[PDB]
């Protein structure tokens, strides 16, 4: 209890940042740097209220659409009813005694709740922008559980599909998807440590049989089910397990609470699968290690791979350089990119550079079996060529990988266990749902590019490419995508690469001193829609303190994502930031890691993990640019410049001890 | 925080599950537990409750009766009229809170005497394990209370108005009796603002006037506000304006020390001490802590009379012995004298036999003279401004203030009236140096005493004669029946005591390892009981059910390291508490330095000043406590629950190798 006086200062400092009622006292009367701000349109009451008109309509529209009838589930093979597990971990069974199972058989509910998605997020928009424009973009999209009609229909999409088995040589994958053999991990190591080193979400579902969050399910998975899964892989005794504890191989096909468009949610509600934690984990050893060793577009000029691309630190400009080296169609190779279903294609006609950023309709249901089997092989094989001692174990793991991605039993609603009738079609949500879409896409655009050399330049048109992709590759292209755009390869300041978007973002050049910096950008509607529609349903218990903070965090993220480069966008968020109280800026917050909340857009860094220098700092224009530029990220300008001085409430007044005294 | 490694997720679970006692109960429920030697319990709930509730009442009702008495008026203190309030502001608030004292116009302060005793839970266990009618009595002789008003005044009067004797104290004499390592003094010349920061003090203690709040609440309002105002006015040597404009800056608070008083003398004994202003108390402590850490003790220099720095742990208990066992024959060659303030350890030989004197002084603070205090300050000040005079005249001014604080700082007691000590003899207890000021006056007096023996004055070895020499030549009282030289077992056997005498509140004992004897502290069970039964903490209103059973553990775990394990009877009572404490409350996330459980009450284990355990769920075994007081390594602290590490995270690593072949 006896401290040094410099410690007691550090004591109060790290403590005072948590006393809000005291934080205002100190901070309320202090200088503050104000971001560029769109001026206030209506009063408080007018704004909060209009956000409840838009909200109520959206709900009553979703509610009305949640009353439609879902289609039958004949298109799925039925395995009958899987019984309850089954295995205990000392005190408790791994499948909690009370949690959902219809006494004897496993079962689950079906979230389709409408539909309140905050309301302050839109409120801030009404206050600082035109109520007529705010309202329309706020009726454009909505984030909800979806509808039963749109769920089954979109499920029947990626189930009934007719896929084309991509003829793929293992050397072709070495061509299209190069990798540094060293950045893979020694998979010959003992299994325990290798699974622990796996990065996965902590709050997501652990799947069967746990039916609890992956953290509250980790010790049961790790110490109980993992060895019991291991010891059955070693002697191919998985079929014994699959009958005594069949839940260990069960999945859950769920509707993704996601930001959907309003007039298309009686049709479109995307389904995803959740495999068991032990299955999801063990497989993730390979998919994560390989994805880390994967080279991308910029590094290797022979790669069609984008899975691992980021914008910041020249990355946004690396896309440009890699794009312009594309060749005149029919004579020299083009430059195609593949991050899952999203693709960036660059070809040249009559010298000029053209860009297409097309989309595939429900592309997950299009991935053929032999593609999946090859990828799984290619990954497993690439591992056991450098770390060869475990040559047959990871094979058995790889064989399991394919089952999960193709023929894995899953629950949808009630006790009934369903399964895809055909080996084709990818079960979205399966460990590796990013490379499978990538590979199928790349192989499709590889053959397409190969077709161009044969003088068949007709495939540069939409009408023809649609047929070619459909009949020869089973892949299907959105009508109205294949729209070649003249690219300004060397744009000027404020000028754009193209109008199109890769990874949901336009490219843009902005000014740095004399230099120009290639940065991501969006039209105001796209920035505004994202703001109004937040990927989090209202917590209710959440405090008036925390959402005022969450808005500040989200407002910061979008500016980093490129909202700063669009004036109408930058102004709104800058207002939101400047709207935010002093205490909810310098409060010690609890997100990775006290440095505020990171931007949701996961392509800013390799890691997906982008993290701010500080909690009490806003992204200024010249800072955000400093990110995407090659060189240093600049000073992150503190909202309250000398805040450290007033929380400690100590202004170092230096006093020497050498003074001559009167 | 969303995506992270499973390696880090277990880290989350582990660090978190330790905060869920509902789970630690479920996990730590039926686990493997290491047990301590335990006293066969003799009672329990209800059967031991009233046993303590009755004692708790009869204590209070005797304290309340003792708190209800007259208090001889304060005529012995000069009265200074009344001091106005500050005054000085600091942004949105003063340095003197709007609500707290005064009452009106100018400063006051309320001296409270609760009734108002310690908790009973700690006593309940003593009734739950130990001899009832013994604990019924030993709990009644001592208690931790605010004290009584007569006991407060009488002893205040006793130390403010005692005829002291100024000491012959040449500064070169102080170099002998108090040698210091000149290099290890803090470079007092480097800047004041940063120099003050490196000062250690109790963060929960009162900061004194004009703050009237804890040192944590008053730290900022001192350093960027008051201290410059103090510095400014010092360097101009116009401190004499800061007097009359803001007099509460030099005002102290004379409060009664709440500690362990014996119930008989409650009506005539309650220790007073002066809470000094934080800025004053801080600035001075620059020279104290620098010199306290640069001082030398028994075990180092042989000439030194100083103990202020001695610690038992790591050979210290034996380092005391070897220093003692070269005290010569009385009258022919120098003895061995040991001064830690008002606690002294004298060794001398009489016809070859080694003898030990452990006497005490009666209110020794009030016996400390002016010239001693004046020459100690001068000694500590000049020791700094010679290695680093590059700051000579500033700290000399600081020195004169140090003198003022320890001598005639005006102070409040009760109500509004500011008093002040009539004479300039008598030390103001609670000042920064009370531990060195006492030490010097002790050493200065015993030096003369030792010098007298070399005149054939061996008569002073007897108590009847030693009493007068200290009262008529140093004004230093010695309690009646303490000066009793006991023959010393110079080489104690295993379990055999050095002497039965008491230095620094502890006996010196010798215990066993394998093959070597280890010198350790010790106390009889009656003393370990009193220390247990009387916690220096009153109930603390709102503190939960659970937080106490961790406290009883952390206390019991503390006495054992102090030396409660080396006594057989005491080792049983503590183990009984450790064994009875809950599984969860052993391994749970505890909040004391630095998560490694609570420290022990004793301050002289390692000094330094900070002794803390390796772990939070550790049990202080016999074989581990000895490992401290021996010169060897500290053993790994035995876990009460060895497998709790894995039992908490519910993961025991199963080796599953991937190189194995796949067959059938
Ligand atoms: N547990 C302990 N922790 C710290 N110091 C201790 C402990 N036990 C003894 N001491 C030291 O030993 C000394 C014991 O002297 P003690 O206070 O008993 O004299 P006293 O008779 O109470 O004098 P007074 O007349 O002032 O009441 C203390 O001053 C203290 O410095
Ligand atoms: Mg404050």
Residue numbers in the entry:
A (entry chain A): 11 to 672
B (entry chain B): 10 to 673
What did the publication describing this PDB structure actually write?
The RdRP core adopts the classical closed “right-hand” architecture consisting of fingers (helices α3-α13 and α15-α16; amino acids 41–303 and 375–443), palm (α14, β6-β8; 304–374 and α17-α18, β9-β10; 444–519), and thumb (α19-α24; 520–649) sub-domains, encircling the seven conserved motifs (A to G) that are required for substrate recognition and catalysis.
TaVpol-ssRNA-rNTP complex co-crystals were obtained after incubation of TaVpol with the oligonucleotide template 5’-CCCAUUCGACUCCUG, ATP, CTP and MnCl2. The structural analysis of this complex revealed the presence of an extra density at the polymerase active site in one of the two molecules of the crystal asymmetric unit (Molecule B). This density, was interpreted as the presence of a bound ATP molecule, with the ATP base tightly stacked to residues Y611 and F613 of loop λ6 and the triphosphate moiety occupying the nucleotide entry tunnel, contacting the basic residues R280, K278 of motif F and K488 of motif D. Unfortunately, the electron density corresponding to the ssRNA template was too weak and discontinuous to allow the building of an accurate model. The phosphate molecules, visible in the TaVpol-ssRNA-ATP complex co-crystals, associate with the fingers domain in the template channel, likely representing the template strand being directed to the catalytic site.
